[PDB]
C-alpha cells in the first residue's frame, strides 16, 4: 500500500534548482545531513529530561555512516527523536516552503548555495548527489515509514516491514553513477574533519569487506 504526493510547487522549484544549477562545491550534502541528525538528537534528549522513558526505544544516542558500494548508497543513520507519517508528509518535519522563499530572497541579496541549510531545507542538499532518496524512520508516536523520492515533482510514504529501527531516522542516499567519491572512506573521512568536527554525537564510519 504506496501512497504518492505531488510535492508542493516551491519545493518542487527548489528541488530542480538544485538538481540542475551547476555547482561543484557538492560535498555540503553529508554536513547538511549531519547537522540534521544531530537536531534530531537534541531533540530527544532534551525530552528525555523530563521524561526518562521517552529512550526505551533505545538509550544511545549516535550517527552512523555506512557506505556500500555493491548497492552504490552512503546511508546516514541517527537514533534521534524521529518522524511521524504527519511529519514526513509535511516536508520531512521542515518548514520548506517559507524556507525556501527566505533561501531565495537571501541569494538575491548575496548569499550562496551552500548557506542552504539556515534556512531549514538543508536536507534537499541530498540531491546533489543522490538521483534518488529513501528515508526509513521511527517517532515513538508512531508506526516505522518510508520515504522515498527520485524528484520530478513526487514522492511516495509507505508502511515500513523492513528491519525495525527502534526509533531515529536512516537516509539512503542512491549515489549518481558519477558521485561514488562518497563512498570512499577516506574521502568521507576527509569531509567530516572538515565541516562536521565539532557535532556533539559520536560518528562512526563503517567500513566495509
Ligand atoms: C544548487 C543550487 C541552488 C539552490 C537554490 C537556488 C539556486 N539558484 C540560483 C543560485 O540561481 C541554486
Known sequence: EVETF???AEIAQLMSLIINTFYSNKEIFLRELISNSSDALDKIRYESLTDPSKLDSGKELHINLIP???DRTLTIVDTGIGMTK???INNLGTIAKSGTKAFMEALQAGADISMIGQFGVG???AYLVAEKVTVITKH????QYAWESSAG???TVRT?????????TKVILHLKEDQTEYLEERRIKEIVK???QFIGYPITLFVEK
Open 6 to 8: 505531488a510535492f508542493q
Open 68 to 70: 556500500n558500494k555493491q
Open 86 to 88: 504527519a511529519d514526513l
Open 123 to 125: 536536507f534537499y542538499s
Open 140 to 143: 515513538n508516536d508512531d508506526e
Open 153 to 155: 515533482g513526487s514522492f
Open 160 to 168: 515500513d516491514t523492513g528491519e525495525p529501527m527502534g526509533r531515529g
Open 194 to 196: 572538515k565541516h562536521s
